[PDB]
Design a protein around this nucleic acid. Structure first.
Length: 15
DNA sequence: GGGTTAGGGTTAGGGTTTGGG
């Protein structure tokens, strides 16, 4: 639950 | 525009992972 984010790989994220 | 992932797009919710705000 505390790790639901993650921030999927190169996908719009942190250009 | 901008923020975890962070930009765009219009739209306020959506959308690669995604909800607002």
């Amino acid at each position: 639950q505390a790790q639901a984010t993650i921030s999927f790989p190169k996908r719009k994220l942190s250009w």
